[PDB]
């Protein structure tokens, strides 16, 4: 199969590396029992989506729940927690990231259940943003581990080296589980043929700019 791999990554050293080397970093720390059963499966260029419709990888609607507001995310994209050129093996391991979610090179997203999406534990408390992502490549976590996948309901697509801001279309600003705004990313590279952004008439759609006055709402640290 063909795959775009790490094309969406923001970290330059992960961008520049070969697919075999990134695959090595992701799989090397897997137990021998897991390596016997599992293989590292990247999202293919052509895939079967959650409604059994065959789509391009860029047209699969992914989402990321994140506490950080558009003034950072639309500006920087999704930069992973570990960006350094010589990370520890713990920080590059897909299985440990999928299982425990310790600091790593990966950015977590989830597939839109075309039928709804997986919701985190405290999504209905505080200020949370559901970012809409249309990106190439990424690692399919369920296809990689199969029944050994620790949290299969998450439907996780992990991105080693992050996600560029050009692949983020929009963001739903929720205050205590209630939508306030729908942010529109002006720098979104539109691949064409996408559905309109999911919206009721009551929710205002706001075109984002750098340092937007309403664009930095967040929880207290």
Give the nearer residue to ligand NAD in terms of CB position, either 32 or 173. Answer: 173
User: Residue 220: exposed, middle, or buried by beta-carbon count in 10 A (0-12, 13-18, 19+)?
Assistant: exposed
Strands 205-207 and 178-184: parallel
Cβ distance to ligand NAD smaller for residue 80 or 87: 80
Comparing CB distances to ligand NAD, the nearer of 20 and 114 is 114
- Our measurement of the distance from residue 42's CA atom to the centroid of its chain's CA atoms, rounded to an integer in Å, reads 14
Q: Is 68 in the site for ligand NAD (CB under 6 A)?
A: yes
Q: HSE (CB half, 13 Å, CA atoms) of 92?
A: 17
Report helix, strand or coil for 26.
Answer: helix
Does residue 27 belong to the site contacting ligand NAD (CB under 6 A)? no
Rg for the chain, CA atoms, rounded = 17
User: Which CB, 72 or 214, lies closer to ligand NAD?
Assistant: 72
Kindly state whether residue 142 participates in binding ligand NAD, applying the rule CB under 6 A: no
Q: Which of residues 78-137 bind ligand NAD (CB under 6 A)?
A: 79-81, 101, 108-110, 120
Q: Give the helix, strand, coil percentages of the chain, each rounded to 5.
A: 25, 25, 50
Residues 6+ apart with CB under 8 A from 83: 11, 105
Determine the size of the site formed for ligand NAD (CB under 6 A).
Answer: 15
Stretch that binds ligand NAD, among 9-17, 37-45, 74-82, 195-203 (CB under 6 A): 74-82
Q: Which residues bind ligand NAD (CB under 6 A)?
A: 64-68, 79-81, 101, 108-110, 120, 154, 156
């Amino acid at each position: 199969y063909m795959t775009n791999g790490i094309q969406a990554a923001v970290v330059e050293w992960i961008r520049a590396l070969d697919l075999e080397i990134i695959s090595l970093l992701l799989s090397r720390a897997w137990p021998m029992a897991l390596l016997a059963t599992s293989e590292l499966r990247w999202r293919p260029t052509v895939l079967t989506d959650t409604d059994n419709v065959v789509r391009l990888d860029r047209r699969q609607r992914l989402v990321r729940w994140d506490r950080r507001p558009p003034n950072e995310i639309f500006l920087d994209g999704f930069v992973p927690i570990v960006t350094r050129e010589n990370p520890d093996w713990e920080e590059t391991d897909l299985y440990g990231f999928a299982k425990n979610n310790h600091p790593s090179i990966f950015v977590s997203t989830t597939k839109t259940q075309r039928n709804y999406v997986w919701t985190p534990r405290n999504a209905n408390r505080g200020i949370v943003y559901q970012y809409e992502i249309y990106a190439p490549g990424g690692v399919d976590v369920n296809d990689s581990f199969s029944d050994a996948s620790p949290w299969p309901n998450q439907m996780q697509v992990a991105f080693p080296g992050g996600i560029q801001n050009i692949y983020i279309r929009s963001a739903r600003e929720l205050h205590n589980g209630r939508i306030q705004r729908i942010w529109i990313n002006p720098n979104f590279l539109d691949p064409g043929d996408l559905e309109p952004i999911v919206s009721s008439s009551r929710t205002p759609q706001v075109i984002w700019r750098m340092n937007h006055p309403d664009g930095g709402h967040r929880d207290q640290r």
